[PDB]
Peregrin
Amino acid sequence: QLTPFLILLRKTLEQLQEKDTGNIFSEPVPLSEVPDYLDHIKKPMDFFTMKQNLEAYRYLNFDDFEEDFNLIVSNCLKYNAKDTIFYRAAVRLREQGGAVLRQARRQAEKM
Ligand SMILES: CC(C)Cc1ccc(S(=O)(=O)Nc2cc3c(cc2N2CCCC2)n(C)c(=O)c(=O)n3C)cc1
């Protein structure tokens, strides 16, 4: 159950959600509100879905965790026009969440 790596991934996920101060990536993009979303985005991602994958043991190395974080950003940049709050927020999350992942990957390395 509890492993140091899974505890580290929990801490890191918390740290990334902290940077999404608007909570706009906290849950899946509401498919009812944007029914064309799945025509552009093959694999939606969000922080709640990441928590679901984490607790279901779907991340066994830091790479796979980071790959899902990257989808939260790249999905948002891909779907939204550049001059939008969403697009700008994904850029901000890319920068701020990148710093989070850098220091968390160091801890995953020495494990
Ligand atoms: C001017 C606006 C910022 C005002 C605004 C517009 C639409 C909507 S919403 O009801 O459509 N909800 C929504 C659509 C998203 C989205 C995230 C959300 N939420 C879920 C709850 C947090 C915001 N994200 C992350 C995307 O990347 C994306 O492309 N979309 C379509 C919500 C707010």
Q: What stands out?
A: Residues 24-25, 27, 29-30, 33-34, 76, 79-80, 85-86 surround AXN (CB under 6 Å).
